């Protein structure tokens, strides 16, 4: 029947829907920097947007690693035990912090990077004075992403949103104290965003720290009481299971970063309105990415409390949700190429051009949600290897060539960005129906061989 | 020549004042700095003024005291008053705009003017 699905479909989207608004208060970060920036300079608002284009890959390097604990922690909830809890916490700690080394190093390396881009030193001094503010967030931003993977695993959401939307809320205040030089506070013009980052995601850490204490709906887990010690063997197992989903991560933001490169060649006023649909495609993406995370925690807890078939109709509404979400929003963009075009910049050739990409960015949009849900549903079962060689192999090397095939080269007149648009619809084609085909494959196995599977 | 145009200037005896105006157009000019350059025959481009988002002028060290620059931001203009000229202060004047083309980038635009001509004599 169909009284039987909707109960899950009703499950997931209230395991769905906060994490969302904790998602996007997230980048509200970033962007109420940059335009409480540009209140006082255009060399600043200038000059802590670059810094924010090496800080943000960077922790979601950093972040990659710390995504393999919600499937550990879910699964022990489900099983019911419940006692091995504290001890996998007490080591994801000690890897955040450990994860924290390398890249603190990284961003040390800034001056030496800006070098490599011809940037003038009056806002040189500026971004690396933002870097060097910022850098003092990252032992308390891992810290607070594993706390945060830990009380996702134990399907409670609510806690996040309430403490990413009061840490937005004391971002908006707090910059003017720091940027205006007021209240007995430095002048420090273009660096009070940096301190005024560190600051909020302190206070963050602390309060979530403090809610966990006092909590009486996670009482029954005891987690503040053992003072548990690292232990290499059993350390080196979330290891294994984290790297991959870095890597893909990692391999995605470059060849975003090459398709740049590429495309620079072209007219500057081309240039543009790519960063603009790009800029645009990539905010949209939350929220198949909300409903992978869902899936995410919702298919350990079955395959935890030794049901099967909840996995497998989980996974399927979990498909099903994220592809109407898809259609719903790729209409609602076709609709409406008009006003935000208007809303990101003034001049009309530019707009003129966008309006143009915004078509295959509707595409765009339909397939990589479809594609995102298929990883995160295949993220639940604890197969954290197969996804890197699919998304690899359908990225960089179908992705890649076809576009410069269909764009420079003039095979098959010329095209510009659009040929490099298609090649990315055809990567992000030919990556679903892979993962597609993993996942019919991993569920059509028998019951002792895929809980095996899933119990490691 | 597109997005900023200049008018204002014309002869005028020494010891009497201007008003420059620099019209911008295609630009958001709300994250935008400003400023005013000349060049006079035999000489090289140089500044003469400067404005900065939100205000902050820096007017050149020969300047001081007479050139007084503004913004307006409801009509997006930028003025420039000039007060006791003297005969070195002929020349044609440009304006310069520089900011972010869109809310998504992350580079510096820079564009020009094609200048106004001044010229102070008896």
């Known amino acids: 029947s169909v009284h039987r699905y909707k109960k899950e479909a009703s499950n997931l989207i209230k395991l769905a829907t906060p994490v969302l608004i904790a998602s996007v208060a997230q980048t509200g970060m970033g962007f109420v920097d940059t335009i409480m920036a540009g209140g006082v300079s255009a060399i600043d608002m200038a000059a802590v947007s670059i810094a924010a284009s090496i800080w943000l890959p960077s922790i979601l390097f950093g972040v990659g690693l710390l995504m393999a604990l919600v499937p550990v922690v879910a699964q022990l909830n489900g099983a019911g035990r419940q006692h091995k809890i504290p001890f996998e916490v007490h080591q994801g700690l000690i890897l955040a912090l450990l994860v924290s080394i390398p890249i603190i190093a990284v961003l040390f390396q800034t001056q030496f990077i800006i070098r490599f881009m011809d940037v003038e030193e009056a806002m040189a001094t500026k971004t690396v004075g933002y870097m060097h503010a910022v850098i003092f967030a990252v032992p308390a931003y891992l810290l607070f992403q594993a706390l945060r993977s830990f009380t996702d695993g134990m399907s409670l959401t609510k806690p996040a949103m309430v403490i990413g939307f009061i840490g937005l809320l004391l971002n908006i205040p707090l910059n003017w104290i720091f940027v205006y030089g007021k209240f007995g506070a430095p002048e420090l013009g273009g660096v009070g965003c940096g301190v005024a980052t560190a600051i909020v995601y302190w206070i963050m850490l602390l309060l979530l720290l403090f809610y966990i204490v006092t909590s009486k709906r996670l009482a029954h887990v005891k987690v503040f009481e053992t003072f548990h010690k690292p232990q290499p063997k059993e350390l080196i197992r979330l290891f294994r299971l984290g790297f991959p989903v870095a890597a893909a991560l990692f391999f995605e933001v470059t060849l975003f970063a090459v398709v740049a490169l590429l495309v620079a060649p072209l007219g500057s006023t081309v240039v543009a309105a790519h960063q603009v649909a790009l800029n645009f495609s990539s905010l949209v993406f939350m929220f198949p990415m909300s409903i992978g995370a869902a899936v995410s925690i919702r298919v350990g807890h079955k395959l935890g409390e030794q049901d099967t078939k909840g996995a497998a109709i989980a996974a399927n509404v979990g498909l099903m949700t994220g592809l109407a979400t898809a259609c719903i929003t790729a209409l609602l963009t076709v609709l409406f190429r008009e006003q935000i075009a208007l809303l990101y910049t003034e001049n009309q050739v530019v707009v003129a051009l966008a309006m143009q990409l915004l078509l295959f960015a509707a595409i765009y949009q339909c397939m990589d949600a479809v594609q995102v849900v298929a990883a995160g549903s295949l993220r639940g079962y604890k197969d954290m290897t197969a996804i890197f060689h699919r998304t690899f192999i359908s990225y960089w090397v179908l992705g890649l060539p076809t576009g410069y095939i269909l764009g420079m080269t003039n095979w098959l007149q010329p095209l510009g960005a659009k040929g490099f648009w298609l090649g990315f619809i055809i990567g992000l084609s030919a990556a679903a129906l892979m993962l597609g085909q993993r996942l019919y494959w991993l569920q059509k196995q028998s019951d002792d061989v895929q809980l095996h599977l899933a119990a490691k | 020549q597109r997005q900023l145009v200049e008018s204002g200037g014309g002869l005028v005896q020494p010891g009497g004042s201007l008003r420059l105006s620099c019209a911008a157009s295609?630009?958001?000019?709300?994250?935008?700095?400003m400023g005013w350059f000349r060049q006079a025959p035999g000489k090289e481009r140089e500044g003469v003024a400067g404005?900065?988002?939100?205000?902050?002028?820096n007017y050149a060290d020969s300047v001081k005291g007479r050139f007084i620059i503004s913004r307006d931001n409801v009509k997006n203009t930028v003025y420039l008053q000039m007060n006791s000229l003297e005969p070195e202060d002929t020349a044609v004047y440009y304006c310069?705009?520089?900011?972010?083309?869109?809310?998504?980038?992350?580079?510096?635009?820079?564009?020009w003017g094609k200048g106004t001509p001044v010229t102070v004599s008896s």
């Open positions: 404005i900065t988002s939100g205000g902050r002028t």
């Open positions: 310069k705009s520089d900011g972010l083309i869109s809310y998504a980038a992350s580079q510096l635009s820079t564009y």
């Open positions: 295609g630009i958001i000019f709300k994250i935008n700095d």
